[PDB]
Write an enzyme that holds these catalytic residues in place. Structure first.
Site, PDB file in Angstrom:
ATOM      1  N   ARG A  11       0.799  -1.229   0.000  1.00 12.73           N
ATOM      2  CA  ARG A  11       0.000   0.000   0.000  1.00 12.73           C
ATOM      3  C   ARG A  11       0.832   1.279   0.000  1.00 12.73           C
ATOM      4  O   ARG A  11       0.329   2.363   0.306  1.00 12.73           O
ATOM      5  CB  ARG A  11      -0.983   0.017   1.179  1.00 12.73           C
ATOM      6  CG  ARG A  11      -1.958  -1.167   1.215  1.00 12.73           C
ATOM      7  CD  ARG A  11      -3.291  -0.778   1.845  1.00 12.73           C
ATOM      8  NE  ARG A  11      -4.169  -1.929   2.054  1.00 12.73           N
ATOM      9  CZ  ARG A  11      -4.046  -2.797   3.057  1.00 12.73           C
ATOM     10  NH1 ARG A  11      -3.080  -2.645   3.952  1.00 12.73           N
ATOM     11  NH2 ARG A  11      -4.888  -3.818   3.166  1.00 12.73           N
TER      12      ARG A  11
ATOM     13  N   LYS B 213       3.801  11.732 -10.653  1.00  8.82           N
ATOM     14  CA  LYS B 213       2.975  10.919 -11.555  1.00  8.82           C
ATOM     15  C   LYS B 213       3.691   9.643 -12.010  1.00  8.82           C
ATOM     16  O   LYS B 213       4.722   9.703 -12.689  1.00  8.82           O
ATOM     17  CB  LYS B 213       2.562  11.712 -12.800  1.00  8.82           C
ATOM     18  CG  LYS B 213       1.293  12.525 -12.646  1.00  8.82           C
ATOM     19  CD  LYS B 213       0.845  13.104 -13.987  1.00  8.82           C
ATOM     20  CE  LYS B 213      -0.292  14.094 -13.814  1.00  8.82           C
ATOM     21  NZ  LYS B 213      -0.699  14.753 -15.084  1.00  8.82           N
TER      22      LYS B 213
ATOM     23  N   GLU C 264      10.775  18.637 -23.747  1.00 10.47           N
ATOM     24  CA  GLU C 264      10.184  18.994 -22.450  1.00 10.47           C
ATOM     25  C   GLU C 264      10.853  20.261 -21.938  1.00 10.47           C
ATOM     26  O   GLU C 264      10.193  21.102 -21.329  1.00 10.47           O
ATOM     27  CB  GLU C 264      10.368  17.879 -21.410  1.00 10.47           C
ATOM     28  CG  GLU C 264       9.695  16.545 -21.738  1.00 10.47           C
ATOM     29  CD  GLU C 264       8.194  16.616 -21.734  1.00 10.47           C
ATOM     30  OE1 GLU C 264       7.563  15.618 -22.139  1.00 10.47           O
ATOM     31  OE2 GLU C 264       7.643  17.657 -21.324  1.00 10.47           O
TER      32      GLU C 264
ATOM     33  N   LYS D 229       8.441  23.306 -13.143  1.00 11.24           N
ATOM     34  CA  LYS D 229       7.451  22.273 -12.869  1.00 11.24           C
ATOM     35  C   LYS D 229       7.152  22.218 -11.389  1.00 11.24           C
ATOM     36  O   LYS D 229       5.996  22.179 -10.985  1.00 11.24           O
ATOM     37  CB  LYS D 229       7.940  20.898 -13.331  1.00 11.24           C
ATOM     38  CG  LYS D 229       6.821  19.845 -13.395  1.00 11.24           C
ATOM     39  CD  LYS D 229       7.341  18.464 -13.794  1.00 11.24           C
ATOM     40  CE  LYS D 229       6.198  17.504 -13.999  1.00 11.24           C
ATOM     41  NZ  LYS D 229       6.651  16.139 -14.334  1.00 11.24           N
TER      42      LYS D 229
ATOM     43  N   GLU E  21      -3.485  17.800 -10.345  1.00 15.04           N
ATOM     44  CA  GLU E  21      -3.876  18.309 -11.661  1.00 15.04           C
ATOM     45  C   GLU E  21      -5.330  18.746 -11.589  1.00 15.04           C
ATOM     46  O   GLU E  21      -6.176  18.281 -12.360  1.00 15.04           O
ATOM     47  CB  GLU E  21      -3.715  17.242 -12.763  1.00 15.04           C
ATOM     48  CG  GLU E  21      -3.780  17.801 -14.208  1.00 15.04           C
ATOM     49  CD  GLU E  21      -3.893  16.725 -15.306  1.00 15.04           C
ATOM     50  OE1 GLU E  21      -3.202  15.686 -15.213  1.00 15.04           O
ATOM     51  OE2 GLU E  21      -4.663  16.926 -16.278  1.00 15.04           O
TER      52      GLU E  21
ATOM     53  N   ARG F 101      -2.080  22.402 -13.375  1.00 19.44           N
ATOM     54  CA  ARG F 101      -1.091  21.386 -13.778  1.00 19.44           C
ATOM     55  C   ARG F 101      -1.446  20.803 -15.141  1.00 19.44           C
ATOM     56  O   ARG F 101      -0.671  20.061 -15.742  1.00 19.44           O
ATOM     57  CB  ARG F 101      -0.989  20.254 -12.739  1.00 19.44           C
ATOM     58  CG  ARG F 101       0.116  19.251 -13.046  1.00 19.44           C
ATOM     59  CD  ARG F 101       0.357  18.232 -11.910  1.00 19.44           C
ATOM     60  NE  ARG F 101       1.408  17.291 -12.300  1.00 19.44           N
ATOM     61  CZ  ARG F 101       2.053  16.439 -11.499  1.00 19.44           C
ATOM     62  NH1 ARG F 101       1.782  16.352 -10.195  1.00 19.44           N
ATOM     63  NH2 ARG F 101       3.016  15.681 -12.016  1.00 19.44           N
TER      64      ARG F 101
ATOM     65  N   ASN G 135       0.686  19.557 -19.784  1.00 20.96           N
ATOM     66  CA  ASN G 135       0.148  18.713 -20.846  1.00 20.96           C
ATOM     67  C   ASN G 135       0.154  19.433 -22.196  1.00 20.96           C
ATOM     68  O   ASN G 135      -0.494  18.989 -23.155  1.00 20.96           O
ATOM     69  CB  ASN G 135      -1.288  18.309 -20.506  1.00 20.96           C
ATOM     70  CG  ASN G 135      -1.406  16.854 -20.095  1.00 20.96           C
ATOM     71  OD1 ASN G 135      -1.293  15.954 -20.929  1.00 20.96           O
ATOM     72  ND2 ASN G 135      -1.631  16.616 -18.800  1.00 20.96           N
TER      73      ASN G 135
ATOM     74  N   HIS H 253       0.450  17.472 -25.531  1.00 18.34           N
ATOM     75  CA  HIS H 253       0.454  16.031 -25.268  1.00 18.34           C
ATOM     76  C   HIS H 253      -0.820  15.349 -25.728  1.00 18.34           C
ATOM     77  O   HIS H 253      -0.865  14.123 -25.849  1.00 18.34           O
ATOM     78  CB  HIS H 253       0.639  15.739 -23.779  1.00 18.34           C
ATOM     79  CG  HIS H 253       2.011  16.042 -23.269  1.00 18.34           C
ATOM     80  ND1 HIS H 253       2.614  17.272 -23.432  1.00 18.34           N
ATOM     81  CD2 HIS H 253       2.886  15.283 -22.567  1.00 18.34           C
ATOM     82  CE1 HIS H 253       3.801  17.258 -22.852  1.00 18.34           C
ATOM     83  NE2 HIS H 253       3.989  16.063 -22.320  1.00 18.34           N
TER      84      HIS H 253
ATOM     85  N   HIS I 285       0.515  12.383 -27.319  1.00 18.93           N
ATOM     86  CA  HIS I 285       0.361  11.043 -26.758  1.00 18.93           C
ATOM     87  C   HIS I 285      -0.250  10.081 -27.761  1.00 18.93           C
ATOM     88  O   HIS I 285       0.016   8.882 -27.717  1.00 18.93           O
ATOM     89  CB  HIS I 285      -0.504  11.093 -25.503  1.00 18.93           C
ATOM     90  CG  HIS I 285       0.265  11.373 -24.253  1.00 18.93           C
ATOM     91  ND1 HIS I 285      -0.339  11.782 -23.083  1.00 18.93           N
ATOM     92  CD2 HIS I 285       1.587  11.265 -23.978  1.00 18.93           C
ATOM     93  CE1 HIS I 285       0.577  11.911 -22.138  1.00 18.93           C
ATOM     94  NE2 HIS I 285       1.754  11.603 -22.654  1.00 18.93           N
TER      95      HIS I 285
ATOM     96  N   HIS J   8       9.012  10.091 -27.004  1.00 23.99           N
ATOM     97  CA  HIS J   8       8.107  11.022 -26.347  1.00 23.99           C
ATOM     98  C   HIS J   8       8.282  12.478 -26.767  1.00 23.99           C
ATOM     99  O   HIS J   8       7.310  13.113 -27.157  1.00 23.99           O
ATOM    100  CB  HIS J   8       8.234  10.917 -24.832  1.00 23.99           C
ATOM    101  CG  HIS J   8       7.144  11.627 -24.105  1.00 23.99           C
ATOM    102  ND1 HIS J   8       5.816  11.482 -24.444  1.00 23.99           N
ATOM    103  CD2 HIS J   8       7.180  12.512 -23.085  1.00 23.99           C
ATOM    104  CE1 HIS J   8       5.078  12.249 -23.664  1.00 23.99           C
ATOM    105  NE2 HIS J   8       5.884  12.885 -22.831  1.00 23.99           N
TER     106      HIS J   8
HETATM  107  O1  LIG Z   1       1.783  16.828 -14.990  1.00 26.26           O
HETATM  108  C1  LIG Z   1       2.810  16.187 -15.411  1.00 26.26           C
HETATM  109  O2  LIG Z   1       3.757  15.794 -14.695  1.00 26.26           O
HETATM  110  C2  LIG Z   1       2.812  15.893 -16.924  1.00 26.26           C
HETATM  111  O3  LIG Z   1       1.756  16.614 -17.561  1.00 26.26           O
HETATM  112  C3  LIG Z   1       2.516  14.365 -16.984  1.00 26.26           C
HETATM  113  C4  LIG Z   1       2.496  13.903 -18.370  1.00 26.26           C
HETATM  114  C5  LIG Z   1       1.933  12.489 -18.361  1.00 26.26           C
HETATM  115  P1  LIG Z   1       0.125  12.310 -18.503  1.00 26.26           P
HETATM  116  O4  LIG Z   1      -0.362  13.253 -19.535  1.00 26.26           O
HETATM  117  O5  LIG Z   1      -0.035  10.787 -18.896  1.00 26.26           O
HETATM  118  O6  LIG Z   1      -0.329  12.644 -17.089  1.00 26.26           O
HETATM  119  C6  LIG Z   1       3.894  14.078 -18.998  1.00 26.26           C
HETATM  120  O7  LIG Z   1       3.953  13.561 -20.286  1.00 26.26           O
HETATM  121  C7  LIG Z   1       4.240  15.620 -19.040  1.00 26.26           C
HETATM  122  O8  LIG Z   1       5.568  15.802 -19.588  1.00 26.26           O
HETATM  123  C8  LIG Z   1       4.130  16.256 -17.647  1.00 26.26           C
HETATM  124 ZN   LIG Z   2       5.624  14.725 -21.600  1.00 24.74          ZN
END
Ligand SMILES: O=C(O)[C@]1(O)C[C@H](CP(=O)(O)O)[C@@H](O)[C@H](O)C1
Ligand SMILES: [Zn+2]
Length: 352
Positions: free
Chosen positions: A115, A136, A178, A221, A231, A235, A239, A242, A246, A256
């Site tokens: 857990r 995440k 990124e 970040k 999020e 937050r 994205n 993405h 994605h 990526h």
């Molecule tokens: O909030 C985050 O950490 C992200 O949005 C998390 C995403 C993954 P998700 O869209 O599957 O949450 C990642 O690709 C991005 O670079 C940063």
């Molecule tokens: Zn990303």
């Protein structure tokens, strides 16, 4: 450079130095046990790199599949069952040593072991300056990337900046997407400023002035994640690009960052389509070429399949698709984007 999450309770450090790999042991023995989950290729690369701390009585090396090939349900069971067979305790730690993929996985393992156990992020890529912060973690589904996972705060993050000296260009570009994204988010200044420094392939490839644009990325970040950990609104800004990204990464199986870049230009295409922020598409398109981004799959895209994938996206609601659009540096907005835009933006992006 040390940093710290400013949440109310349980906060974690982030060591971003060229010798941060030392900061591992100040923890290892304060944990009944430690399981080192390490990518199958990273394990080859840094064979002895981790002997100074692995040849211990607690530490055990666990070798999972290389990158994104480990983020599956099947591997999740195996690795956990394998781990548990060592009569662990709630005070064990999982040490992730590899890319963002080995990080998300080890994190989802650590987050669910008994857990929840202890989690130590030890990124080795440029993209992981991103993936290792925020908590995440997770694996992938047959439906898409990161569809099962959880929000789990790592005990500490250790980003040794010396691991970048062994990164191939394909990953520099990938990770750079990124570093560049946080920039777009940091304003018109930071973008044109990073665009000004990293002018073309040779600059990037060389990595001069990178150590700086990474620390600036991590910070950027750390702010969005501390301010909106679950999020719950803002937050959603990490994205950026993405939604389409994605979909291209999963379906086209491309790195990526590469997908994100393509996800970025496509996002601008829409920000025009809707708000008409009048984006210099020809500017971004070129800047990518110079940096050395491929752009060969651009022609093999396919709105139809990508769209259906885009319905699995974690940002949508019952109303339909949802994207993070930029209307102006400092004016990012999230909102519905019916197939319309997605029908003429995947084609206007094909115009290139
Ligand atoms: O909030 C985050 O950490 C992200 O949005 C998390 C995403 C993954 P998700 O869209 O599957 O949450 C990642 O690709 C991005 O670079 C940063
Ligand atoms: Zn990303």
């Amino acid at each position: 450079m040390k940093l710290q999450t400013t949440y109310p309770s349980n906060n974690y450090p982030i060591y971003v130095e060229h010798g941060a790999i030392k900061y591992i042991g100040t923890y290892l023995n304060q944990f009944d046990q430690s399981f080192l989950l390490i990518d199958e290729y990273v394990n080859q690369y840094f064979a002895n790199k981790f002997d100074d701390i692995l040849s211990y009585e607690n530490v055990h090396k666990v070798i999972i599949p290389a990158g994104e090939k480990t983020k599956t349900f099947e591997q999740y069971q195996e690795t956990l069952e394998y781990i548990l067979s060592h009569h662990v305790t709630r005070n064990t730690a999982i040490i992730a040593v590899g890319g963002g993929a080995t990080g998300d996985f080890a994190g989802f393992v650590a987050a669910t072991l008994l857990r929840g156990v202890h989690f130590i992020q030890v990124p080795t890529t440029i993209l992981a300056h991103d993936s290792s912060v925020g908590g995440k973690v997770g694996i992938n589904s047959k439906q898409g990337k990161n569809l099962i996972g959880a929000f789990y705060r790592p005990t500490a993050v250790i980003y040794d900046l010396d691991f970048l000296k062994t990164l191939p260009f394909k990953q520099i570009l990938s990770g750079y997407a990124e570093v560049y994204k946080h920039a777009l988010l940091n304003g018109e200044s930071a973008t044109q400023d990073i665009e000004q420094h990293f002018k073309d392939r040779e600059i990037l490839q060389s990595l001069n002035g990178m150590d700086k644009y990474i620390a600036k990325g991590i910070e950027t970040k750390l702010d969005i994640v501390v301010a909106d950990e679950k999020e719950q609104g803002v937050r959603k800004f990490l994205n950026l690009g993405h939604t389409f990204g994605h979909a291209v990464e999963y379906y086209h199986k491309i790195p990526h960052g590469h997908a994100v870049m393509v996800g970025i230009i496509y996002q601008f295409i829409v920000a025009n389509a809707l708000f008409d922020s009048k984006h210099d598409i020809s500017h971004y398109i070129q800047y990518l070429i110079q940096l050395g981004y491929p752009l060969d799959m651009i022609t093999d895209l396919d709105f139809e399949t990508l769209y259906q994938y885009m319905l699995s996206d974690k940002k949508n609601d019952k109303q339909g698709v949802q994207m993070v659009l930029m209307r102006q540096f400092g004016d990012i907005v999230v909102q519905h984007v019916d197939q319309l835009t997605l029908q003429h933006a995947c084609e206007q992006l094909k115009t290139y």
